[PDB]
Design a protein around this motif. Structure first.
Motif, mmCIF file in Angstrom:
data_model
loop_
_atom_site.group_PDB
_atom_site.id
_atom_site.type_symbol
_atom_site.label_atom_id
_atom_site.label_comp_id
_atom_site.label_asym_id
_atom_site.label_seq_id
_atom_site.Cartn_x
_atom_site.Cartn_y
_atom_site.Cartn_z
ATOM 1 N N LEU B 25 0.811 -1.031 -0.130
ATOM 2 C CA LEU B 25 0.030 -0.113 -0.036
ATOM 3 C C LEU B 25 0.961 1.048 0.013
ATOM 4 O O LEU B 25 0.620 2.308 -0.691
ATOM 5 C CB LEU B 25 -0.937 0.118 1.256
ATOM 6 N N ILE B 57 -2.811 8.113 7.780
ATOM 7 C CA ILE B 57 -3.789 6.977 7.959
ATOM 8 C C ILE B 57 -3.491 5.893 9.039
ATOM 9 O O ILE B 57 -4.362 5.421 9.840
ATOM 10 C CB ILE B 57 -4.074 6.468 6.564
ATOM 11 N N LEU B 58 -2.172 5.496 9.201
ATOM 12 C CA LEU B 58 -1.816 4.359 10.134
ATOM 13 C C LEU B 58 -1.916 4.965 11.279
ATOM 14 O O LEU B 58 -2.433 4.086 12.019
ATOM 15 C CB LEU B 58 -0.203 4.195 9.901
ATOM 16 N N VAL B 63 -6.655 -1.830 11.888
ATOM 17 C CA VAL B 63 -7.741 -2.549 11.436
ATOM 18 C C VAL B 63 -7.807 -4.134 11.897
ATOM 19 O O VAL B 63 -8.896 -4.505 12.143
ATOM 20 C CB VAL B 63 -7.560 -2.743 9.771
ATOM 21 N N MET B 74 5.428 4.809 16.140
ATOM 22 C CA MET B 74 6.612 5.304 16.534
ATOM 23 C C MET B 74 7.147 6.305 15.295
ATOM 24 O O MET B 74 7.719 7.365 15.506
ATOM 25 C CB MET B 74 7.819 4.341 16.262
ATOM 26 N N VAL B 77 6.810 10.063 16.303
ATOM 27 C CA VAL B 77 7.836 10.751 17.120
ATOM 28 C C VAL B 77 8.669 11.400 15.931
ATOM 29 O O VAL B 77 9.359 12.580 15.895
ATOM 30 C CB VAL B 77 8.740 10.030 18.036
ATOM 31 N N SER B 493 16.199 3.366 14.739
ATOM 32 C CA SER B 493 14.984 2.742 15.236
ATOM 33 C C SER B 493 15.084 1.275 14.694
ATOM 34 O O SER B 493 14.846 0.341 15.446
ATOM 35 C CB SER B 493 13.710 3.307 14.737
ATOM 36 N N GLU B 496 18.013 -0.393 16.606
ATOM 37 C CA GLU B 496 18.184 0.075 18.056
ATOM 38 C C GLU B 496 18.000 -1.239 18.908
ATOM 39 O O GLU B 496 18.707 -1.541 19.572
ATOM 40 C CB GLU B 496 17.069 1.229 18.400
ATOM 41 N N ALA B 497 16.855 -1.564 18.952
ATOM 42 C CA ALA B 497 16.009 -2.747 19.986
ATOM 43 C C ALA B 497 16.848 -3.855 19.275
ATOM 44 O O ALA B 497 16.999 -4.961 20.007
ATOM 45 C CB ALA B 497 14.700 -2.826 19.616
ATOM 46 N N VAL B 500 21.731 -5.428 20.884
ATOM 47 C CA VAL B 500 21.627 -5.795 22.356
ATOM 48 C C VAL B 500 20.661 -6.841 22.327
ATOM 49 O O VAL B 500 21.155 -7.956 23.312
ATOM 50 C CB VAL B 500 21.314 -4.549 23.410
ATOM 51 N N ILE B 501 19.641 -7.060 21.918
ATOM 52 C CA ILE B 501 18.691 -8.255 22.268
ATOM 53 C C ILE B 501 19.043 -8.982 20.848
ATOM 54 O O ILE B 501 19.038 -8.762 19.742
ATOM 55 C CB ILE B 501 17.324 -7.628 22.024
ATOM 56 N N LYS B 509 10.892 -12.058 16.068
ATOM 57 C CA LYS B 509 10.180 -13.367 16.714
ATOM 58 C C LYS B 509 9.288 -12.983 18.011
ATOM 59 O O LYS B 509 9.698 -12.171 18.638
ATOM 60 C CB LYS B 509 11.159 -14.543 16.692
ATOM 61 N N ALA B 511 7.948 -13.919 21.855
ATOM 62 C CA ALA B 511 8.322 -14.306 23.191
ATOM 63 C C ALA B 511 7.392 -15.140 24.203
ATOM 64 O O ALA B 511 7.057 -16.166 23.899
ATOM 65 C CB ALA B 511 9.091 -13.114 24.077
ATOM 66 N N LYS C 37 8.885 -8.898 25.777
ATOM 67 C CA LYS C 37 7.704 -9.972 25.479
ATOM 68 C C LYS C 37 6.465 -8.968 25.143
ATOM 69 O O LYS C 37 6.141 -7.921 25.599
ATOM 70 C CB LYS C 37 7.401 -10.429 26.959
ATOM 71 N N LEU C 158 15.015 -6.024 26.576
ATOM 72 C CA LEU C 158 15.462 -5.584 25.282
ATOM 73 C C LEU C 158 15.875 -3.994 25.549
ATOM 74 O O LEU C 158 16.375 -3.271 24.864
ATOM 75 C CB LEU C 158 14.066 -5.199 24.584
#
Lengths: 494, 513, 513, 74, 74
Positions: B25, B57-58, B63, B74, B77, B493, B496-497, B500-501, B509, B511, C37, C158
């Motif tokens: 889209l 729109i998001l 939906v 996010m 921001v 972004s 970012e996460a 470290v993880i 995936k 948890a 999580k 995380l």
């Protein structure tokens, strides 16, 4: 019955499904810890075909409704001029179909995209003679003759624990094979096992039949006879006359063995045992055909057939103990043009892999002689080509690039597959592999025993040069037929 | 609590599907010729909302069951400190997920494969540190006011046949908005009428309401009154019950008491000189006759949002009970009048001395396609504010994306073991953007990718995707640019996460549960 | 009692399924390379709560029919005496159930096997003063206050990009907390604004309520007033009604009566110098006008839980009817003001004489991961309080687990009869933890187990599992340590819980204490 | 970015269908031999309305889901 | 006996459908960048034949109920 209506997207989908189902089955077949597959069907199939060779089982049958029988057929032509190494052509062709979903995204016309295959064909050839390799295979070659491709081809096969030794033997067979004729008259059969050698090499043709328990154990200075054709008291007497004609002609010649491709009459059987002559009943025609070129042959007619009209080579014919079982040996052929290869194994009916591993094996090193060209094994060729091909997609003006780049990343799976089965983490392996190849050392490759990367040449692994040139040209086109065809005209009673 | 059970493979798959559905889209949306998506919903909104801004729109809609809402949240921001330009950030993240299917073949440690985010830290480096952006944007500025970045945001939008001019108008709005005083009080509406300008610039705030058929048409040196409490009178907190009285004589005082409310409103309203009254709610009938004779224009049921902005505009007032007039209220005094616009009747508040607050009125053909202007405009207001003080931009039209992709490919192979596998996968992620820009232009995507890469590889950061051309061209001539923050924030972004993880590249995936 | 007919093997199976189901989800959680999580629910939960803290999510919901909630409930008891570091106790209990499959072949008496756990009491006891640990933890401390265990608890989370800094802050909070009382008056509120520091330490208590638009912004030498009874006056549960008055004239007296409530509130409020008023419930409108002119800031519908902590903070007061001012109320005076914190406005109470009660405020990038910080703080606070009183802790990263495992292997063949089979099985249980810790790291678990055992066997207690490296390393430099009582209680608790599982005919729901 | 969705070719059809339906009803209206049209619908209208003028009849009613009303207003 | 009922305009459609079905397979074949197709079938056919010539493949088979074989024959 009449039914099965499919068009446009649905028709494409049938092509899509055929490729995905085949890829998973052929997926663990590539590399050292390949998986054994065993497949049986009722009727004339027989019993034992357990297939580790993807090309052999696929070629043999066409079991179900989806269309893929023809794509499968294509791989064998590749096989005749080279084939295997590991079965990868089908996998590469299958993965191309995934992008077909993106084709509807392009929402214009699929035909513009298929031109990429022609381009892929060029890509195949520009991935051939550039970006160097081993430059060995001088001829005969005391150490580089094998312990190479066969070890990798064998790698996909479990029997590698004692079979890697077998693999070394196979090139000796090609050394004799090279010369005057072509790839002809080579016969090989497994005989389960019970020896460290796991194979004896016969200087001549291998046969497996016996007249009966009685008869002389050995024959020397042997003449070989091959025949195309298999007052009431005088009739009985006449039977004696057939016996008489057979014996009178036989003794002067000194006949040591008789082989016939059909039923043999019982009366002569008693005669052969006393004379010192061994006969074979219903011997396969194919074995005989191979044998005629080898022994100088003869003219096969009626009982006039002995003496001069037939030629009998005379080195050594014997029934010998092979590890455990008895198998007949025809050997010492003066011509030397045609030979027989014999192999054994551990015995888990995984040994039967050798029955068809061998089919791939037979073509590869026979080919090696003819090529005087080879490439590094253990996936060394694939990483190098992958590094070179990524650059190549932008190198081309366009059209060619899109297909060429997708093709390039395809090569990545092979290194992964080679070490995946190896018992080592694929992720660590793929990254380390590239650094050695990008460095400029073509000798670097997957060291499977090691679990990391090492010098492939030290290990002793190289692949026939033809396997790489033909496979690349063949893969793109074999792939093209399923994607380009939207709507296959049929009728499917089943 | 309850329902929806997902683990490892299946759970990874839900993330996978959310990214692919959004990408198609948003795919048509990017670059000088995008496409319009039109939405209709039920039970909580009035009609057809059409947005060419992926972010707008998001934010509004969640939906279905699959996860994608948090990734979407996010991006806002990002808008506050940079945002828009063109919506490309969502697309980069989605393509990350495609490589995950090839990872199951490996079947061991995605985490080992994952060596890439540290490698993608490089993306924070390579994508937005090499290539000299932009510099001056002096102040007010004659020619450089626009005809550049606003135009690029709009080009990706279909309305560019006439809206390129609209974009040009928006920076004029930002010039008044620059200085000291905060980002507030900007109001824009669209009118159903066709004209070449397709928009009109007001000197103040626009409202659409009228007292009634009677009352003076126009007021001057206007005084503005805003009341929180309604004009209506009768019930009070304690009813005092409905009374009956000892004869007809005392019932009269009750009617008389009503007159007193009328009296207070005119007697002190007159001293002020009151020219206009705006009330956010129901309005009592008695004052209405009075206002017409006085020469005062009042507004019934005025919208509260207009009112709050208006207070900033006129210096404001404290709104309480009828004591509210005179000094407690401040009224600006240039010109307040009701003026017919194209076809509809509108009331214009203008000449605000303070100057902090201003309003823009759009005009159009009367099509759904016209509603497109509302979506583009919102995008434009945010784009210009950020461009003026960020002092940093990147070449648009996918110029940035192809360059980084070439650089990231090198990174793979150069690093030895472990490190190399994810870095190449991250690298291919840049390739889809070139494809997204070409496809929406009606040119063959396959042909475009090949030719695109060669120009970027050469070293001209200016060269990019020209959709009108169908091939490649000089992006700078077009004036297509993306703000530095929009590109910079997304890369962090994404990585970012991710860092470290499972500390490295090929994320997420599921948890617990 | 008796309804759910399950017997022996089927009954065992329900216990069996519950342990395996929870083990995989919590598995990600245990090491520095843990994962966050995401949870989805319907039925008054209103939002997705992101929790990698195994204890928090398990306590909140009893999702399905198989029993596990009571087992789950127990881990909290562990929590007040310590609770965290990383979750792991649940995993060990679950691992024991899978070998029960080999016990059906055994087909004897489940209880006879159980003697292993009484034996495990020996293991619990000898896992004590056996491990070799760190002493210190003097009080307050110089540089060992943190950058240690709180960071490890966080590593599995995380948030450890920006967040590891946040953890460091928490020990400062615990230093003020030490004394007798353990955990009273500690409050944390999430902030949506952006700061690199990502946290602010308040010297007092944080709320988030406002009197109204008017009122003085700042108050000095503030006096605090708390009222049990609301400012509102009228209906009660016995109705005045909606009264009858003879001639409208007398309705006026009722209005006058309202004024008297206002008069009491102002006359004695002034003598005190009242700077702030806090009421837990609805506030009446009349006083509101009064407070603004006086220079007093009041809070409408303040939450009761905030108030109780505040009372301990101020010095406490007796809450009754409007007589409540002066001495019956104790007001602490320092600084009460509303300060904007980069985004959403809040009211800050600070300068508490008591010092026992304090509030920590967190700031961040702005996402689901940010809400994660609330999750992380709860774990951080509990660890430090335990670390000071225990005076003993053990090496983390699974260092403790491998050492004990080497010692227990010797024990099984040496012990008599039934004891031997039982003890040997208990010993192999410890082996799985090294495998779980390595697997989330990004390095090969199989390789990891062998290399791990060789270093522990030798005698280096410091050596342990290093997840970022993927091999064995020195744990003490890393800073990962576990509280000594976490290990004492888990050892005794694990054996008792496993032991009862085989014994009980049916499982179902919670009731004990 | 979703609602009632049809894509590219299917999406095109909804606009395509609205134009063909209107053209046949309006075609008979034009010139010397044009003919009068009458409409009847349920609820909130009454019964027979006859409009020779194409503009007057289209403006009055938004009969169904497919788009065409905005085109009609112009 | 009776399963499919067709009259006048729908009859035209059955005839219409045959032209579209043939056109998609044939169009790929046309011009310097065409494609090749393989047909299996059963009974009195040795093996699958793959035909590029539209004429040769259509002449060899009469697969289904719609009428197109005669058009092919010419």
């Amino acid at each position: 019955a009449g039914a099965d209506e499919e068009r446009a997207e649905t028709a494409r989908l049938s092509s899509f499904i055929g490729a995905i189902a085949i890829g998973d089955l052929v997926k663990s077949t590539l590399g050292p810890k390949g998986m054994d597959k065993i497949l049986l069907s009722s009727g004339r199939d027989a019993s034992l075909m357990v297939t580790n060779d993807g090309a052999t089982i696929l070629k043999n049958i066409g079991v179900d409704n989806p269309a893929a029988k023809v794509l499968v057929d294509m791989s064998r032509v590749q096989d005749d001029e080279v084939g295997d190494g590991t079965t990868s052509v089908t996998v590469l062709a299958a993965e191309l179909l995934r992008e077909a979903e993106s084709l509807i995204a392009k929402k214009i016309h699929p035909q513009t995209i298929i031109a990429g295959w022609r381009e892929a064909t060029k890509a195949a050839r520009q991935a051939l003679l550039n970006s160097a390799v081993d430059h060995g295979s001088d001829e005969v070659k005391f150490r580089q003759d094998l312990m190479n491709i066969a070890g990798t081809t064998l790698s996909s096969k479990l029997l590698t624990h004692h079979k890697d030794h077998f693999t070394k033997l196979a090139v000796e067979a090609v050394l004799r094979l090279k010369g005057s004729g072509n790839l002809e008259a080579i016969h090989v059969i497994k005989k389960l096992g019970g020896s460290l050698a796991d194979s004896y090499l016969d200087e001549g043709f291998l046969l497996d039949k016996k007249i009966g328990v009685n008869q002389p154990k050995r024959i020397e200075n042997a003449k070989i006879l091959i025949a195309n054709t298999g007052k009431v008291a005088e009739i009985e007497h006449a039977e004696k006359e057939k016996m008489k004609e057979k014996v009178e002609r036989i003794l002067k010649h000194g006949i040591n063995c008789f082989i016939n491709r059909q039923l043999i009459y019982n009366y002569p059987e008693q005669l052969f045992g006393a004379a010192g002559v061994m006969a074979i009943e219903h011997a396969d025609f194919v074995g005989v055909e191979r044998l005629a070129l080898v022994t100088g042959g003869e003219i096969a007619s009626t009982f006039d057939h002995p003496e001069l009209v037939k030629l009998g080579s005379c080195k050594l014919i014997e029934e010998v103990m092979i590890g455990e079982d008895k198998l007949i040996h025809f050997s010492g052929v003066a011509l030397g043009e045609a030979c027989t290869i014999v192999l054994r194994g551990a015995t888990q009916q995984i040994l039967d892999e050798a029955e068809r591993s061998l089919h791939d094996a037979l073509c590869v090193l026979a080919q090696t002689v003819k090529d005087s060209r080879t490439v590094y094994g253990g996936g060394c060729s694939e990483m190098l080509m992958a590094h070179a091909v990524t650059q190549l997609a932008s190198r081309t003006p366009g059209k060619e690039a899109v297909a060429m780049e997708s093709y390039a990343k395809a090569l990545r799976m092979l290194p992964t597959i080679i070490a995946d089965n190896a018992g080592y983490d694929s992720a660590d392996l793929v990254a380390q592999l590239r650094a050695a190849h990008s460095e400029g050392k073509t000798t670097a490759g997957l060291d499977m025993k090691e679990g990391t990367i090492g010098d492939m040449s030290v290990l002793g692994i190289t692949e026939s040069f033809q396997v790489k040139r033909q496979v690349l040209l063949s893969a793109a086109e074999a792939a093209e037929v399923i994607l380009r065809v939207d709507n296959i005209i049929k009728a499917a009673p089943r």
